[PDB]
Each structure stands twice: as C-alpha cells, then as structure tokens.
Write a protein that binds this DNA or RNA. Structure first.
Ligand SMILES: CON(C)Cc1ccc(O)c2c1C[C@H]1C[C@H]3[C@H](N(C)C)C(O)=C(C(N)=O)C(=O)[C@@]3(O)C(O)=C1C2=O
Ligand SMILES: [Mg+2]
Ligand SMILES: [Mg+2]
Ligand SMILES: [Mg+2]
Ligand SMILES: [Mg+2]
Ligand SMILES: [Mg+2]
Ligand SMILES: [Mg+2]
Ligand SMILES: [Mg+2]
Ligand SMILES: [Mg+2]
Ligand SMILES: [Mg+2]
Ligand SMILES: [Mg+2]
Ligand SMILES: [Mg+2]
Ligand SMILES: [Mg+2]
Ligand SMILES: [Mg+2]
Ligand SMILES: [Mg+2]
Ligand SMILES: [Mg+2]
Ligand SMILES: [Zn+2]
Lengths: 155, 84, 86, 60, 206
RNA sequence: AAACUCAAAGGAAUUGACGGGGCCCCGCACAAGCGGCGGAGCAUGCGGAUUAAUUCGAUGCAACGCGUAGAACCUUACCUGGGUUUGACAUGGAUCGGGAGUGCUCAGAGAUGGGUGUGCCUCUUGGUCGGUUCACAGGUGGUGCAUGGCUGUCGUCAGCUCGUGUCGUGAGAUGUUGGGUUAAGUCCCGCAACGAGCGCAACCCUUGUUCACUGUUGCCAGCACGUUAUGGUGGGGACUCAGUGGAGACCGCCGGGGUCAACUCGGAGGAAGGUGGGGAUGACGUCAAGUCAUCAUGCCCCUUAUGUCCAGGGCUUCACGCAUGCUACAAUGGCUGGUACAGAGAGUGGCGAGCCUGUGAGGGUGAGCGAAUCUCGGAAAGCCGGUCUCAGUUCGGAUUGGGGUCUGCAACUCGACCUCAUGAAGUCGGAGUCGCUAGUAAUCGCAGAUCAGCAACGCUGCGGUGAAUACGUUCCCGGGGC
C-alpha cells in the first residue's frame, strides 16, 4: 500500500514435527478454511514420506523446498511502447512462499487419486530433483537467464 | 393437489347445474367461470363453456377428463409464435 | 498444544492438575479461552516467577478479534456484491 | 393509497384468507409491520419524530 | 437530501420520546389512536400554534400535554373550547382523556413555532428574506447560540425552485451532546407549498 | 474597393473546470495474493418480442434478488365481461322517518336483487339511518423540468465559507500561500492578516479488561439430600452470566529523532498503544439525479366515467439478450452409522414438547410457555468407523411420469413439501470482468422481517471453521493540496 509495509503475522510451528515449514504447508493447502482436513492431508503425506524413505519427513520436505526455491524471477515492465521481462532477485521469504505454492499446486495437478499422497509423491520427487515443481523452477530460472540483459532496470 | 380427505372441489353451482341438466336431459351448454372446479363423472358427456379470461370456450367433457380441473382445457394465454 | 503450552512455558509441567468448565464458541475458541484461563491462573498463583515469561509469550492477553458484524448492502462483513458497470 | 381500497381493506373480507394489512397511517400495502402497524416510511418518520416509545436508532 | 433528523439522531441520547406508555398486545392500535389524536389536533388547532403533543397512558386513560404558544385559542372562553376539544377527543378515541395545555416560555426560541411563524408569513406573502431575517434576529435577541433557517420551494411565487437559507452563530448538527431543537412547517401558498426548516442551538447538555 | 453579412470582433486580467503539464499525496486503484463471475442447469430482475392485459416506476458508475420486508383470490393499480351513479368512503344543511344493522332462505360467477325472522335509546324535542336532492365526494389520471418531504450520488472525500482588516479601478485576493506533520483545513512554524462557522475529531451505540451492586426464570466453589438419575432440593455471592453505575488509554511514563514544535521511532506497564475493532453520524454543493405510486401539493384533465363494486384473466407469456444469485462439474469428495462445540433471535388464530400412527411430508391426541423458566432445538462444517475407487460415476439433480400431504372459499393457469421412478447439461468455463488487507476472504449452518401458505437460492442479522499476500507507486481507475 501507499502508507508502508504492512505488518506480517507471525508463523506458528507444527505441534507434531516442531517446524514452521509444516505449518506453512498446511496453511497453504488449507482449502475452504478446513484446517483439520488440510493438516490430516499433510500429516498423511509426511508419514508416507517417512514410510518410503527412512529419512525424516521434515528433512525431506526441506530438501524439496530447497530444490523448488527460485533464485530470481522476471516481472513485467512498462518501459517504452513494449513490455519487458526484468529479472529480479527473490528474497528468502518470497522464494519459500513460491516453492510452497508451486509444490501445492502441482500436487493438486498430479494424476494420482488422493491429495494426501499426490502431495507425498510430489514431495519425494522434488526432493530427489524431479517433478513438475522442479521443472517450473528450472523454466523460470531459464527465462530469467534469457532476459538477464535487463538486470540494470532494477530500482 | 387437493387433500384426498377433503374430497374433490366442485364449485357447488356447477354441480347443481350439471345435476339439473342430468335430470332434465343431458343436452345444453353450461356456461361457467369455474375454472376452479374438478371434473366429475356425473358431468361426463356434457359441454361446459369454461371462461378463459375473455370468452367461454366450450369443452366437451369425455371419460378421461375426470381427473382434471375445468380450467386445464381453457388456455388463457395466446402465443402463436414470435415473429411470423 | 495451545492449551498445554502454558505449563510448558511456565516452570511447572504436566504434574499439576486442572479442572475446566467451558461454554460457548467452537472448539478452537474454547481452546483459546481455556489457554488464557490457565495462563491467568498461573499468573495469579505466581505473579513473580511465571509472570515475566508468561506475559512475554503473549499469553496474559485476550485477543479482541471477534466476528465482525454484517453490513447493509454487503453480502458479508466486508464482502461486496459483484459490481457490474453497464 | 386509494380511499376505496383503504375502506375495503378495513371492512371484514368475504373469505378470511382475503384480508391484508395496509399502513394504518398511510394506506401503503407494502412493508407493513405487525408490531405497530404503519409502514416503511411511516415507521422511519415517526421513529425519528419520537412518537413511537422504545423505538430508537440502532448502531450496535 | 442526505441529512438526518436532529431529533431522531439525538433521540435517547439527549432528547426524549413524545409518547410514554408500555403495551405489548395493542401496541399497534394505541399507535393508531395516537396518530388520530395528533392529526386531529394539528388539523383543528393551527391557530394556537402547536410546539408538541405529548401522550401518556396508564390504564385505558390517555393524558395529552399540548405545548402551545398561545393557549388562548385552545381554552376559548372559560375553558369552553378546552371542554369541546376534550369531548371531541373522547368521541374520536373512546377513552378517558385528561388534557392539559402548557405554555412555551420562549416561542421565539422554540424552532417549531419559529417555522410556524415563517410559514404563516410566507403564506401571507411576505418577502422571504425579510421573514427569515426577522426570525433570526428575534432568536438571537432571545439568546439562542445559533440559528439556521432554510426555505425551499417556489419562493416568491417563481417558477424555478430555490433553497434560500440564513444562519449565524453556531449550529453543530454533528455533535450529539449539542442541544439542537428542530422544527419544520409548510407554507401553503397559491403556488404549491414552501418547506421551512429551522435549527436552533439551545446550548450544550450532558 | 463595393455589394452583401454579423452585433459583435477584440485587449489584459480574475475565478473555475480540464489537460495524452509538473511536483506532492491518498483509496483493494494497481501490484502481491485468495476466491469468483463470463461456459452448464435452475432461481430472480430487466430489455425485447408476444398478448385482450402481459399495471406502473427504476436505465452508465449511482436501473436491473431495485419500490416488492411475500402477486393463486385479495394485494391490483391491468384486460374481458357483468353491476352501480351524492356514488365504495367523508363533511354539512334541509326533508320524510323509525329502526339501523343483521340471522335463515331464494336467484346469481359474484356484485347485487327478492324473501323471512328480529327489531332504536331519550323524549314531544337527541343518538341512528333512509331517500330526494343540495352542497359535494372520488382518481395509483397528467406534469419529479411547478413543488414540499424523503433518498441516491460524487464522498468518510478534506473540504466549503464568513465578519473585520488589508491589496487591487474592478471582478477578485489575502486569511485558506509557504516549511513540517497528520487518517483529517489534524496540529506546529513562519506569515497582512486577525477571527469565527459548517465539515475532521470528541460527546452516542457495540466489542475487548476490571470493580462495586443485585441473585431469578441465571450460576454451583464449600454444606445437607435427592428414585438411580435432573442446582431437582435447602442454601450460597465464590466462579459464569444477566444489567445498572464506576474505573481504564491520555503519546500519560522512559529513551531517541524532531532548531525546538507539532509529530515520529523504540520500550515499560497493561486486557488493550499511538484512532484498539465496528456502527451511528454524510460539510457548501453537484447531477432540472429518483420518487405526483408512501404521503402532501400548484396547475391541467375524468365525472351514468380516467369514479366505484364483482367474477374470471394478467402481472408467472418465450425464437431470444443482459444482470444478480444458487447448485454443480466430484475423492480436501459422495453415501452411511456414531459422536462433539454456538451465537443471535421468535412465540397465544402463536411456539409446541411427549406418546401413538405413517416410508415420509404429515395426521391424531396433546402438556408447557406471553416466556433467562416452555417451545422452536437439530446447530452444520468437524472428529471417528464403514463404504464407494476416478467411472459422465454411488459426481451432478435438471427435466419428466405416478402416488400423496398441508395451507386456503380455491393450488388449471400459478404454491410449497413428501415419496416412487426418470437421471439432462456440466470434465472448471472465450474475450473480458468482480470481491476482499484479519477473525477479513473462503466456506458452514442458524434466526428474523413480510407471511394462511410460499416460488426465500432474496434481504437484514448471528455465530462456527478460518487463510494467502501487500517488494512497492512505474502503469490502470477515482480523488486531494499547490
Ligand atoms: C426528455 O425531455 N427533455 C428532452 C429533457 C427533460 C425534460 C424534463 C425532464 O423531467 C427530464 C428531461 C431529460 C431526461 C434525461 C434523463 C435520462 N435518463 C432517463 C436515462 C438521462 O440520460 C439522465 C442521466 N443519465 O443523468 C437524466 O438526467 C434524466 O434522467 C432526466 O433527469 C430527464 C428528465 O426527467
Ligand atoms: Mg395475504
Ligand atoms: Mg486571455
Ligand atoms: Mg490484481
Ligand atoms: Mg452463467
Ligand atoms: Mg415492467
Ligand atoms: Mg406515473
Ligand atoms: Mg447497480
Ligand atoms: Mg429532480
Ligand atoms: Mg422518471
Ligand atoms: Mg464524526
Ligand atoms: Mg429527470
Ligand atoms: Mg394526483
Ligand atoms: Mg413480475
Ligand atoms: Mg414476546
Ligand atoms: Mg482497507
Ligand atoms: Zn405509510
């Protein structure tokens, strides 16, 4: 807004796994205002993760988030009579938000039956380095590199 | 539809006219505005001019009419189609 | 967690019984009210050794966030009917 | 409203179901409150002028 | 066009209701008789000048306070007019009416009588500017802290409608603790009718 | 040059508005986000078409789930037809009166008309009615561009002006420019200005903390029984709550910034901190904005009709177009069994428990409650168990056929609901477009107004669950100062 940066609500931690990441994940799933449904989905996905690999589900979620985190992304610019795609570096909070949003959206887009282990499959694939989320991260980075010539328009 | 335990609704003057017609010969057209009334077997074979808003259109009541209202056979709106 | 954590942030722990009578609201609102009640009980029991941490954790405070009332001409408290120019 | 309509509404109907309310000050047939008769406009203006006991503006 | 009635705005806060009775199964019919009483009194006692009609009820007994500038018309000769109006009131309602008529200490300060007088002058075809200035000057001679008069309509018998107004002093319409008396009347002329509104800031009240 | 033609052409300046002019600002205005609309079916309003009538009003934002907080009759203002004429209804003079007014019957679609029964209270002159008239009534007939009233709107926008002084021939200017600040023409500093007024703010309502007072129909910590059981009981002022009266927040304190000064940043205390959240409140005026149909009213028009009564019809039409919604397209879901947690409201022609009966809508009996007592009452989402397994489906519930219930004089046109069967489009929607900054959006149910019943999915409220995001002002829209 014009007035200034609005305050941010503090992020709570998940009672079970003790990480703000899982709370952010459930709040991102969180369709229709059904917190209990969303975190049932999230807990089921994390338990499926620890079932298929011995490593900790919170650690595998973290690894997936780092594999989906974008470093820079392009935004539209109205310089002159044509629009430009100016690449801009992404702050850690913004990139965590982008990673979570992409993870959730592509989990919803996956072909498997149930959301819980659609999200589980997507998390495992991202942690390994595969999947639609990682593909989108690579594509956005590729397009930022293609339009890298406009790094001097940053303000 | 009307409750069964309340019986059919015949407008209580259509009934008397059709009964008089039965007593004195089932040959006349009975003019009425009672679209409200229920067709009954006692009037079967009569001809009733049911009002439709502007004219008493005649209907010859047959065996199958009985389970219907008098006004079902006297359309009130004319459409004929849009354009021509 | 929201109702147990007053003890966790206090010196006492899960060796201290509690009896609660709860009315009104939904499950989450009842949880928050019970949490505030336990926090206030610990406060007025030991207002020197548990007061500082208990208040710093933002727990000796009642949030006035209540469902905003509906307003005429609007579908909800702030939702507005779909504007349709021409 | 029309005077004939007002008097017809006042008089007892032929069938009970055929009765209606009418604004007892105004004759208006729409938006008539059972609690105090009157109508939308009559209620608003009389409540503002203060002839209706207990009725005040609400701003909860 | 967009301003609230001052009396309704301050109702319950500073000013009080004109009717004081309680009834929860007859409420509508008591409202109807009250409307009949007020309409009858207004239609038949214009000459006296009615500031307010205040209605009370105890048990099938109605009490009417008539705040009038000149109760000479209401009382007639030795209370004959008072008795006749009371009798018409029983005829109209069917209940025991106890009627008492009260003065207004400062008719030049009560807004309703001020609107009464301004509308009467307009009907008698007095220049509206002169009438408004006279009323304003009289109000401030009495000692009101603020006057505001607005006459709207075919002022001066013209074709277009105007909304001519006068004011000086202070009239804080937005302040609830401000004691603002509001009056309105309609001058019935050969050219429709003129709406005259008067706000008078009596002072500040708790 | 002239004919001809115009009654102005023009100069400087003033105040506005506008600018694809600048500087400075603000608003869900973008951006960042979340969920939609535009596609489908249905509901609803409107345009158009149609019709005997489809009554009238509303028309960019600011008309279109709007007047309508309830159109089968009524409403009803429209149409066909049938009645009526001082009239359906008022007020006043006369004049003949004693019944008026009604019960039962007859004719009639009804209006109405004809029977039959019943028939004033005072008093010798009233209440009440009758005609004949006489005056007169009646009109939702016209003009919202003759008006009052009320309302929308720019716009919760930060402004709009005045007295006196001063400057200028004058319109006019100054104040009200400038610097800083604020949500704010909010304040501060300077200043030919010094002041004041309407707006801003505050006073009001509600919500968040707490104290005193009171203790039923509310509550149950300690005490005594209760059919086992129910604060059911005596009783209790503790807790909760109810509702009256107080306290509390003021940048008041601490520190920094700020020439200082207003302000600003941080901290402590505190339920709450910089306006704590929300409502009421809408300046001078604008749009000849809406309403002659709520009411009122100037003028004009109708007067065996444009009054008025009645039955039936219409306002519900349907090659279409738009708009606002609802249900969806499924697995964060459907079905099914069990099991938690609300608030705000309503009720005597009413809310109705319990029991019996029916597959059910319901019916029959029927307590209780004019209600902190009794009833509406079940909250739903959620949790837990089972099941369906991605299928145009055990998604969706349109349409259509059958059998019903209830309200009502009466559900054909044209009601809701139950049940049995039927099982349409719809695979997330083109260009375009909408709402929202927190207990908000999203969703989940509940209650009320009107109301016999109900086309209500509307409207106004109520609580339950409960987010994501805001780097920022470059761009789009609206506005503010110079
Ligand atoms: C026609 O008669 N002559 C020529 C002038 C006229 C005369 C008398 C009137 O009484 C009106 C009018 C013009 C209309 C124009 C209307 C129109 N509207 C109906 C959409 C409109 O475009 C707007 C608007 N958007 O603002 C209006 O102003 C408006 O509503 C209005 O006020 C009007 C009137 O009533
Ligand atoms: Mg009705
Ligand atoms: Mg010039
Ligand atoms: Mg956007
Ligand atoms: Mg659609
Ligand atoms: Mg229409
Ligand atoms: Mg009209
Ligand atoms: Mg609109
Ligand atoms: Mg106008
Ligand atoms: Mg118009
Ligand atoms: Mg204010
Ligand atoms: Mg107009
Ligand atoms: Mg008229
Ligand atoms: Mg309609
Ligand atoms: Mg009650
Ligand atoms: Mg906002
Ligand atoms: Zn009215």
């Amino acid at each position: 807004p014009r007035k200034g940066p609005a305050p941010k609500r503090p992020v709570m931690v998940d009672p079970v796994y003790g990480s703000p990441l899982v709370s952010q994940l459930v709040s991102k799933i969180l369709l229709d205002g059904k917190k209990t449904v969303a975190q049932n989905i999230v807990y089921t996905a994390l338990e499926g993760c620890r079932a298929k690999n011995n490593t900790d589900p919170v650690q595998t979620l973290k690894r997936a988030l780092d594999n989906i985190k974008p470093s820079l992304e392009v935004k539209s610019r109205r310089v002159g009579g044509a629009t430009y795609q100016v690449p801009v570096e992404v702050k850690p909070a913004r990139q965590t938000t982008l990673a979570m949003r992409w993870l959730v959206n592509f989990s919803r887009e996956r072909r498997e039956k149930t959301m819980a282990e659609r999200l589980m499959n997507e998390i495992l694939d991202a942690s390994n380095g595969l999947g639609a989320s990682v593909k989108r991260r690579e594509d956005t980075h590729k397009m930022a590199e293609a339009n890298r010539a406009f790094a001097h328009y940053r303000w | 539809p009307r409750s069964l335990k309340k019986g059919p609704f015949v407008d209580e003057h259509l009934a008397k006219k059709v009964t008089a017609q039965n007593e004195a010969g089932t040959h006349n057209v009975i003019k009425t505005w009672s679209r409200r009334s229920m067709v009954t077997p006692d009037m079967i074979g009569h001809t009733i001019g049911v009002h439709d808003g502007r004219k008493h259109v005649p209907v010859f009541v047959t065996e199958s009419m009985v389970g219907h209202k008098l006004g079902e056979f006297a359309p009130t709106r004319t459409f004929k189609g849009h354009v021509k | 967690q929201i109702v147990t954590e007053p003890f966790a942030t206090a010196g006492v722990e899960g060796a201290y019984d509690v009896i609660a009578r709860i009315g009104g609201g939904g499950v989450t609102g009842q949880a928050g009210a019970l949490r505030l009640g336990i926090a206030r009980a610990l406060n007025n029991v030991d207002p020197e050794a548990s007061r500082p941490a208990l208040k710093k954790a933002g727990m000796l405070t009642r949030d006035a966030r209540v469902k905003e009332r509906k307003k005429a001409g609007l579908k909800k408290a702030r939702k507005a009917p779909q504007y349709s120019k021409r | 409203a029309k005077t004939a309509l007002k008097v017809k509404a006042a008089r007892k109907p032929k069938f009970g179901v055929r009765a209606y309310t009418r604004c007892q000050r105004c004759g208006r047939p729409h938006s008539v409150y059972r609690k105090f008769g009157l109508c939308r406009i009559c209620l608003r203006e009389m409540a503002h002028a203060g002839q209706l006991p207990g009725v005040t503006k609400s701003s909860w | 066009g967009q301003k609230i009635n001052p009396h309704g705005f301050r109702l319950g806060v500073t000013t009080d209701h004109k009717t004081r009775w309680y009834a929860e199964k007859q409420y509508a019919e008591l409202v109807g008789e009250d409307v009949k009483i007020r309409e009858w009194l207004h239609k038949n006692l214009e000459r006296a000048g009615l500031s307010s009609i205040e209605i009370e009820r105890r048990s099938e007994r109605v009490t009417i306070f008539l705040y009038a500038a000149r109760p000479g018309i209401v009382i007639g000769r030795n209370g004959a007019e008072a008795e006749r109006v009371r009798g018409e009131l029983e005829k109209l309602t069917g209940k025991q009416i106890q009627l008492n008529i009260l003065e207004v200490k400062s008719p030049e300060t009560d807004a309703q009588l001020v609107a009464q007088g301004i509308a009467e002058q307009l009907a008698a075809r007095v220049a509206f500017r002169r009438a408004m200035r006279k009323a304003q000057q009289s109000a401030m001679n009495a000692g009101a802290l603020g006057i505001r008069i607005k006459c709207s309509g075919r002022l001066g018998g013209a074709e277009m409608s105007r909304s001519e107004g006068y004011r000086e002093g202070r009239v804080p319409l937005h302040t609830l603790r401000a004691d603002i008396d509001y009056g309105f009347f309609e001058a019935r002329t050969t050219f429709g009718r003129i709406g005259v509104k008067v706000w008078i800031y009596k002072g500040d009240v708790t």
